[PDB]
Every structure is written in C-alpha cells, then in structure tokens.
Amino acid sequence: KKLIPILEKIPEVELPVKEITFKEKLKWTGIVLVLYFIMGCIDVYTAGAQIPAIFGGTLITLGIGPIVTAGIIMQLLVGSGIIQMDLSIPENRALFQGCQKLLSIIMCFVEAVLFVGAGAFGILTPLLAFLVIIQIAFGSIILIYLDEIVSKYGIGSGIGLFIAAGVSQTIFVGALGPEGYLWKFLNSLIQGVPNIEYIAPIIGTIIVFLMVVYAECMRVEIPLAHGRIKGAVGKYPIKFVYVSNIPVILAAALFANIQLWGLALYRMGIPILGHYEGGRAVDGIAYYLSTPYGLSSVISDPIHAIVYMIAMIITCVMFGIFWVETTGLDPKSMAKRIGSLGMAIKGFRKSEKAIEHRLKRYIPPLTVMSSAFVGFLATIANFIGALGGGTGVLLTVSIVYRMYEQLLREKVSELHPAIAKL
C-alpha cells in the first residue's frame, strides 16, 4: 500500500508516441529556456523595492528547485536503507519517482515559507507574506512542469538546462551587462586608477573554466573483447567526472538547505545551527559549512577551509554511494547489453554472470573515487572562486557538454529510425 490516491491526483505530461523531430525537440527546448529567463526578469508582486538578493538567489540559491531538495531526502532514505526498495520492478521505480515528485511540491511550499520566514524580504506583513509565498512556490512549480516538458518533448534536461542557463546568463551579464565587470574595470583604466578587483573575478572564471574543462575530459577507458571476432578491438570510455554530476548537485544542495535552515531557524527560533547576523552565518555548523567563493579566496581562515573541503568530500562520497543502491549504473542491465554484442571485458570472462560480476565489483570504487574527486575539485574551484559560482560553472561545463552529445546522438538518430538503444 502507498500514497497512491493523492499520487494519482498529481498531474503529468502526455508523452506522444508520435514523431517528435529533432527540429521539434529543439524548438521545444528553446521555448522552455526563454520562459525561464523571462521568469528571471519579472519581480514578485510586493509593494516595495526593499531587498535585492539577486546575488544569493542568482548563484544557485533560490532557483533551487525544491526538486533538488526533495531528491536529497529520497536519496537519503532510499539510500541509508532506512526504507529499502528494489526498484527493478516498475513499481519501486515509479514508486521512488512518483513519491519524490510529490515531496518536490511539499518542499516547493516549505522552501517558499522558509525563505520569507528566513527574512529574505523584510516586511513580514502576514498578509503580504502569505501572498508572496504563493507566487513563489507556484513559480517553482512551473519549473517542475517545464522540466517535465523538456524531459519529454525536447533535448537535455530541465534542471540541467536551468542550471547551465542560470550560470551562463549570470556570466555574460555580470561580466558584460549593465553594471558589468569588464566595463567597470575598463572604465577604471580610463579613469586612470586601474582597479584589479574589477578584472579579478573575470579571470577567476576563465581559470576555473579552463580547469573544469581539463577535468571533464579525463575518462576511464575499459578495453573490450572482440565481438565473435579475434584480436584487440574495444576501448570503451566512461565519464569519470559526469558520473558524479547529479551527485555533487545534491551535495552543494545540502549545504544550501543548511545555510537557509540555519538562518531560518535562527530569526524564527533558537540558534540550533548557528549565529548568523549580517545576513549569513558567522558561527556554528552553518559557518563551518559555508562556501568561501564570490570574488577572492579567503586565506584569513585556514581551518575554515580544511573543514569545508573535508565536509564536502565526505558529503559527495555519500550521495554517490546513495546513487549506487538506487539508480546509477545498474550491472544487471549492463549484463545483457554487454552480452547481445557479446563483448566481454579485455581481461576476460565472456559469461553473463561472469562479466556482470567483474562489473558489480569495479563500480563502487569508481563511483566513490569519482565524486571524491569532483567534490574536491568543485570545492577548490570555489576557493579560487569564479563568476556564476565556481561549483555552478563546473556543473554547467559538464551539463553543457552532455548536452552537446545529446545534440549529436539526436542528429544521427534523425536518420536510422531503429537504433534508439545503441
């Protein structure tokens, strides 16, 4: 038995088995992208231009996608075995999912009320406050459904897009827009008092970017055994960085719900998590778990750094493993997908249960190694600090590339109407 009633009441998106051309999937995606950017330009209805935390929200903060938040819980429960489930059967698969979705809306409002209750606006007029929360959580809802759309009518993924979309925009705007940095620096030069601080963060991004890219390129190549033929053949590569993509998004996401739940459960109760004051946290768990990026790396707190990095690393390894018991690379299906072609490893064992085994073995370490790295990287990428959010930049770079491939797997599937599994 399960929360199937309300669960069945929750709307979905009609997936046509019809012909959805590349051109269409594309044009579909585009439509989503824009409404998003548009939603980013329209201010919420409130009589007063009081607080402008564009910085916060617009650096991965509020566009948060309560989804991520919710997904974090699922991974946690269905992860620490707290609610053991063998997805395999369409039940558990659609159970874990459908359920997470609902929670995504619950959190949609919880986050909403949590933001205003965290003093994100200033005037807590119970009336106006309510009104705001409405609009807010509801917009996030539009994203949940826009994702559904892209996820079943376009290319790439909603979340993924949105992340890359937000990051990319934040860069072009922050660097070249109105109050752009490239300008503020250029002008500072004309003015005759060259200000390194203006050009600075721009450099930081390039750096991060160059770095993030290099790391994104490394792969774990696994030689393969000829398909019924003889001699050296395969050399299959796995995405050592992209493997822990979704994972790292959940990690930095967790820290996000801490700073938000700390400040929240600070000016609305007892300082359980930490003492903030001045907007953010200047003490407590929150403190020891607050990313140091923005403009320039902060050396004036060596210990703070260490803790964080280690704190992140361990959190990344965590969601990675929880990505293993759940979804992730499931050998079972790897089994025959390796079998049909009959391409056993380069090592040996052309037997189903055989290969299938050497795989269920190589996974964990790979997954664990992956995230540990990624997380470390992302963290160090924040120390260095870059526009849009070093960490965000990382995700983007990857999400963008996984998007490119997508555009190719599509560009080709737009010819041989059959090989939609190879």
C-alpha pair distances (Å), 400 with each of 58, 161, 215, 216, 391? 19, 8, 14, 11, 14
- Cα 119 to chain center, whole Å? 25
Q: Collapsing DSSP states into helix, strand and coil, what is residue 338?
A: helix
Q: Between vectors from CA 159 to CA 155 and to CA 162, what angle results, nearest 5°? A: 85
Query: Which method was used?
Result: X-ray
Helix then strand then coil, % of the chain, to nearest 5: 65, 5, 35
Torsion of CA 22, 26, 29, 34, to 10 degrees: -170
Rg (CA), the chain: 23
d(CA 231, CA 152): 42
Residues 6+ apart with CB under 8 A from 91: none
Angle at 378 between CA 264 and CA 389, to 5 degrees: 60
- Left (φ > 0), alpha (ψ -120 to 50) or beta: where does 42 sit? beta
Residue in 251, 222, 235, 248 with CA at minimum distance from that of residue 370? 248
Question: Are the CB atoms for 99 and 85 separated by under 8 Å?
Answer: no
Q: Which domains does the chain show, CATH number per domain? A: 1-422 (1.10.3370.10)
DSSP letters, 120-163, are: SSS---HHHHHHHHHHHHHHHHHHHHHHHHHHHHSSS-HHHHHH
Q: Tell me, what amino acid is at 179?
A: E
Burial (CB < 10 A; 0-12, 13-18, 19+), residue 294, is: middle
Q: What is the DSSP letter of 44?
A: P
Q: Which of 421, 219, 220 is nearest to 336 (CA)?
A: 421
Whole-number Å distance between alpha carbons of 143 and 127:
25
Kindly report each contact of residues 407-411 with a partner whose C-beta sits within 8 Å and lies 24 or more positions away, as own/partner: 407/155, 410/22, 410/25, 410/155, 411/22
Resolution reading in Å: 3.6
- Going by C-alpha positions, the residue among 214, 212, 163 that lies closest to residue 403 is 163
Angle at alpha carbon of residue 331, lines to 220 and 410, rounded to 5°: 65
Q: Which residues pair with 238 in a beta bridge?
A: 220
In whole angstroms, what is the distance from residue 96 CA to residue 117 CA?
30
Other beta carbons within 10 Å of 176: 12
> Could you count the other beta carbons within 10 Å of the beta carbon of residue 354?
14
CB within 8 A of 170, min separation 6: which ones? Answer: 58, 59, 387, 388, 389, 392
What residues form DSSP beta bridges with 224?
345
* CA atoms of 220 and 289, how far apart (whole Å): 32
